[model samples]
Target: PISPIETVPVKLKPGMDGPKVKQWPLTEEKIKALVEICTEMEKEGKISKIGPENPYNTPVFAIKKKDSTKWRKLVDFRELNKRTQDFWEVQLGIPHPAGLKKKKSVTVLDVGDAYFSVPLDEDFRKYTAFTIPSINNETPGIRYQYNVLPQGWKGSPAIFQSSMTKILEPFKKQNPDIVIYQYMDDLYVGSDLEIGQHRTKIEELRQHLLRWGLTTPDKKHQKEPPFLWMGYELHPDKWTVQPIVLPEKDSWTVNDIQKLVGKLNWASQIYPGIKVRQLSKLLRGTKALTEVIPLTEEAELELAENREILKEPVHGVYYDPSKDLIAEIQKQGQGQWTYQIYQEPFKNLKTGKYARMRGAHTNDVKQLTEAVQKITTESIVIWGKTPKFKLPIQKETWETWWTEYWQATWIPEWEFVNTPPLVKLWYQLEKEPIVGAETFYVDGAANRETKLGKAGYVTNKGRQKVVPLTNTTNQKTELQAIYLALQDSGLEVNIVTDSQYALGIIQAQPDKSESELVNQIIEQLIKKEKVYLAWVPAHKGIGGNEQVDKLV
Candidate 1:
């Protein structure tokens, strides 16, 4: 059923002239099938025909439906999305099963092709065009566009979900006894009534959906407990939830590895006490598919064990610990390592600052193991790396690590300011010479033939360096420049750079040398109230930045 709701008009970004062609490549058979489906939809007024010449265009692609030969059409709206205001609300997943089971009855509802039901505003449909092959050899290919909200458009899901929410308002008002939890395309209702009342309420919901030009499939209307919703089995009887792990072949591709990593990360919360150190250790050095080697027998055994541990269900509860400690271990270039034992999140977090050691001279494994044992045997430890035991300490570490790991990293906060007042305030602050109020420029260059990198820094006092770098990857060179400038001189400065890698080091994924450098920079950062690392577009003719560029 087509939705009664008309989507809000798309507001494009300022100064966006028009959309450019950006599409996924399509096979001839797929193109023919897509055009046929599109034409059929157009005949039914689901989409409208567009002009051969248009200001905007997006590409269409086909993905095979699971366990079937059927192809689902998707729009490649990457370029189109850039021009969108992107005001989509952040979506949190389903409510915890623990809360849902408090009610005597529960109903799970699913809406199919939810986005397709919602109509698109006529004026914005032109932005959704995609290419189709010519029906005949004599003519050019046609451009197709959606008249209704299309699936896979960046903001469509949010828009559809918003509309669906509004449609449920009347029903919600009528049923004060029920608690409705709506996730996009899925809704769950909990009530104090028995199954009979649940069925009646479910029917009432269907009527409401019908009035709004929406339909609920018979199979999707469930008024039963222990049903699956949002990748979890919610058992109201036991007041517990378990992940639904479908058995699939373990054979993995590069894309599969990425997808599995995300899935495992999501499941990590439920299996909080699982120790996947061996799996993480294997994953640490892997940057690409080429780096993935066939597993040895020991590694294979570890992988199997890790999978079992991940699937094991954990009881959700809170436990108070007598002691709370933080431990972080980092590996630097050429076998240099550091471990910091801390007690808090703020100024007191570090015990006696970071302890550094050379890997060649020290048994790092033994030292790190001892630290883990001390934390586990004594207190709740939140370590930067996964722990060895499935104790309370390990659980704390996993919970903390998972929570912080998903945070949007390295993005800077930006603000708009009027030039006059800003300039005057800067002059006032500079005249007083605040300890944290300073600026510096950093740059790096590498000679691939010689396998050498040089880092450069520039300061207002005409202080500079062209230091040759060791373990000189381009990223390390960029980082080295920042390190060289900040070392010894203890002033809080706003370092400007064009390299995003340098700015993003702190929240980067698991890596040995990079992690160490990040900690080193972080040590320097803790001493000051403000340490702004600002990014600038390269070669944009800015004076100080351009001068630093020349130094490289």
Candidate 2:
């Protein structure tokens, strides 16, 4: 027989802050349903309650006020920021393989005319004025404060965000020809036109801003031709530069630059939609070359301009040969040399005709490939015979001959896998006295160490991926486990624990490393890098290393 249905009444704590309403004490059935609903809503980015507390109630959702100086006396929200996984632009989209038939044009803005409305006294608003007050004399009218964001004041962020969306409404309606993104005044206007439609929209918006008591960047708020927005440089040339005013300096810095720079000169498929590398090349190589060779600079810049003109297709590729060549050769130096070839290309000294064999350079393969393509002939073989080397090929010229020696050996170490330096050093130490082959992966974990934060590995058909671990301590455990596992699998390894204390005990127990177990493990099952203790973060999951953790 079924039991009688019961209704649990939620109590009101005798006049709570908001309008009091009766809430129910969640029953088992209700709790289960509620969890399911919350999980779905969370995935949709609609609801914030991961458990009981609202995600919106978290500091990340707390909106900022317009005035930078007038800070909201917020409780330290730094920890919350660290924990908050930024969920911006995390949506998935289908791969539009047909390639954009036409890319919608874009207008970019770093929100020049927008401000966080800091409601101030009439006197403070009309004039440039500031005031400081003591605890007793702090009057609301005289002391100006950011009217936004009071921590623990739950509804403020939602209200502020809603207000910003409202303010951007007029711009959207008037500029229906363009696309606009308004996030609390960081505005963007874009379009699909080849000319200046995007710029026109920005100027129109700027004029309207002035009408509504706002101003753009002092000179203008127009998009530059061949504009850059976000990371990918846009329009015409497709060069990479964040859509903002670039510094007038002659040299480009590698500060925020990524691996994209190395791949830019190749086919677009190799490094698609990367403009920064192009910009970097023009800035340093071409621009620098211009100081001494102005004619070459003019020719290069012209091609770049033409390349921009051809950015008609959404995924169009641009190759400015002069600029590409300079940047390509310069990248090989990897910042080692400011100037690539010390002398002009053909001026290098070669004493002997036969003895002057050309040393392999990265550009050789590229040049050869290009030549082959241009000739478009199967019978033609590309050659870079430096009229110097006439030396005969010895029978055993290669240290390691392969059955495939009939094929070209173009470069040595090009595809070599490098051993870790520490591993090599440990092996070198094996020859020395006292330090025997004993090293292992060990983890020093604090209480909060959960398996949720440890690195776990998954293998599918021999391909492995490292799962991210949560806490820093789990990472340490992962490193220790990996080293030991390697040894158990019959590998010789000497694991050096990178942790200062762990290193001492595992290596030779300095006064600081008097830990017994770490020392004992090192003594028993250690081999050089085969079994080594590595000190990684406690649990913040790093991809490559995390897989090793899972292996542990």
Candidate 3:
């Protein structure tokens, strides 16, 4: 029953272009279906006839309903969204209902034709017009637009939420005992007592919204039934929450992975390491599943594990990471960099294996450091994928120079030993291999939309390589170019690259992200007799770099 804000008109951003009008190819079936829907909507005053002179226009499309063969009309307002400023405010960061404990009864009310219930301003209605094909020769090619708010509009969700919030405001003040959770048009009310105790409050809420022109159909009113609300299942008992899982399939397509991830993500809140192995296997086999593939053996075990977990009663209270006691351990002198500890470990109830808790931002490292100091004799082992943490020590005075060790420091300064190296110059070195170096120029390119571009390298010896990369960072592409240059079969080759990123990864303390590729390059260097990476200014017309830039 909430009406449009007539006084405030939607103004375009200064210097912004008008809405883009596009023509969609309509099938005979589509044309007939749209014409029928539009004619009916116009009669109901939801949409009105529009002329050809409107400045703003949007193209409409159709989404077929799963239950019926009829097409559901949808308008594409993407272009309009870019041109106009979004003043619509959304209600987000609301506490999730799954965290609520000790609740007995519940009622969920869904607003009927939610978006359509909110009227659109007459002045702004012209902006929503889309051209439809003529139904017979008599009806000229007409443009119809929504007079009321429609689905697929960018501002519709915010507007609907705002309207629902306004209706619920008074009831919330009157009945402080009842807790109502709202997301867009869905209203969820939980009662600490019996179902009958919350019945009057639910009816009162429905009547309050009805007075403001918001309609909730009889079928939409759910009373404590196990219901799927906001992509989560709210059990009839009002104490448990779970994801709505799709029916098990014989085989899964690439599209099914998306839905599977959604369920797994929700399940991760309670069940850590639940379907992680399965999810990883599914993701790894993505390219293989262009056709369908059977559920993996690991995935079957994972599914079985999840099924067993789901069968148990939901009991453990959800912990807020921002206000929880967490334990952490830091490993030093393992990799080139220190291993900074984060995410306090928790034991997965189902699997019995320890895993990091979800939403852990920081950890209690002081407690762990003290514990490590106190326990001297008893050996402690940390189970993870990294090297073990060992206490640093220095060798005795009688120890050999090679055997002597020193504690590492983050900031390092060094001096040449006063005792000079005993270097005795004798005869000239032996002659090198006959294979001369190849001149290869390497460069890469990328943009915001199509990121992590291809590495382009061209050689005078007719050797060229273009490797597409996954990491969109410029440093990755530069390193990839260097990687390709090293892989080239030559006794010794000069890789002329204009990237300091590639040089840094080769010389400095490389991160784990760079280690995988850099380690491969290291192996290649050992195999080859000699190799050199030369750096030049990025764009100052260096010969080899210029050629690579052209390829880029």
Candidate 4:
């Protein structure tokens, strides 16, 4: 079924007549495939058989699909693209989110026959007229016009993308807790909503699309971690841009090299640090499409460098607002500057030591600034050298998932502020040795969408216990973690916590707290009068806190 949202029709330049070219020449094999596809198109009500007197009868052909087996029937719209204004530059893909952990189950949904699902404007059907060769016959077959948007028309992607945005707005409202992404024809729905809730959201969206007359094919729906979306292979903790291997051939024309190198440019966009510009050497030497070329020695060297880099995963800590964002920036060669933004170094639970991931680096200062502002949901301190000029800050809209395609508005910069390092408590804790006291480090994490609670505690003696709860926020998880630690605390035990919110609640009026769980914790405190509280910075090489964080 076609989408309900209205789509802009292709308009010819004023006073210009639509093109009525003879059907393009095709091989016997391709013509047979096009004839078969034409029959299916008419049966599906996607196209209608029309008389030859129509103003336009554009040529039709078939191109190999990405899978290299199926033929994608396409209308030759180069004539319309040149004469029409509506084929505006629309970004067909989004920049991938750098990296997110695997605990966040990743999912991908491909909208089957996305272009065919878009309704063509009635008045513009004649402009979309095309013809394919009859089976085994040299002469072109009967004329047909698309009733729905057809592939190979430059206007198809932009029109379908806009209509899709409209359809998804209501879907988002229904699932307010979801983190969704809608590209031209693919849908991405993944979040840390505990398994059950995420599964429901996934099926809800499948049903949602079905009700809207859109259907996702069985294979298109993948509950995946090794998900390949737009050629990037994604895992929980890593992202790899799949390098496109050029097809082997003895001799190549300028067109072949350009087509292969041009696709590598797309790889360069999804992955930074790819030296695709080095292919400039191969691109030069001929402007002729059919001119044969040899792979120069320098070009081969560049390809080797690209292959090596592609073998490595895209590494870096994603900007998290809750942690410190430290930027080390400096002016580089020419008019460019480089930004290296680092999140707080994290401790590894396995190695029992701290290690810093490579920082995110970008040459364009404006792009980095825009990324930080858009990715962070809360106000975060940006620690870096003050920009000599006014920092260009802008915010994006929801239409494109805060990606590069969205409209952005300029805003004034955040007023500068000074923040001192947290040092006092660390220094005191180092000097004060508590004699004859038990100690436990506690931590917790929760998915608010699932309302699933996971909290845990690790005593100084290496005793560990993971506890579960419900109806909890992240802060509450920490609170309950401490409570779980206290329940096992016989007497005179020192309790450690990473969250100041959890600490303050217990330190202040624990009884006056509104939460029943907090009140229950207070009653336990009364029962065990000698329990003590110690606050520590998270991921501080503390074995217990690291262990508890892993469990949660």
TM-score of each: 0.48, 0.26, 0.50, 0.49
Task: For model 1, give the RMSD to the true fold.
Answer: 16.9
| Whole-model lDDT per candidate | 0.56, 0.32, 0.56, 0.61
Model 2 stretches astray by more than 4 angstroms = 1-107, 113-115, 118-144, 148-164, 182-186, 192-200, 211-214, 225-230, 236-552
lDDT of 2 by residue, 422-474 (tens): 00111212323223533333332323534454333332123333334444463
Off by over 4 Å in 1: 20-32, 52-54, 60-72, 92-94, 98-101, 140-144, 220-225, 229-231, 239-552
Candidate 1 accuracy as TM-score: 0.48
Write one digit per residue (lDDT tens) for candidate 4, span 310-421: 5564443333435543432232222222233345444210000011111211123233344334323212212222212112222221212224322454432332212221
Give the deviation of candidate 2 from the true structure as CA RMSD.
24.7
User: Regarding lDDT, does 2 or 4 come out ahead?
Assistant: 4
Q: Scored by Cα lDDT, where does model 1 land? A: 0.56
* Model 3 Cα shift for residue 508 (angstroms): 19
Cα shift from native, residue 89, model 4 (Å): 3.2
Best by lDDT: 4
By TM-score, the candidates rank as: 3, 4, 1, 2
Q: What is the C-alpha RMSD of each candidate to the true structure, in Å?
A: 16.9, 24.7, 15.9, 25.4
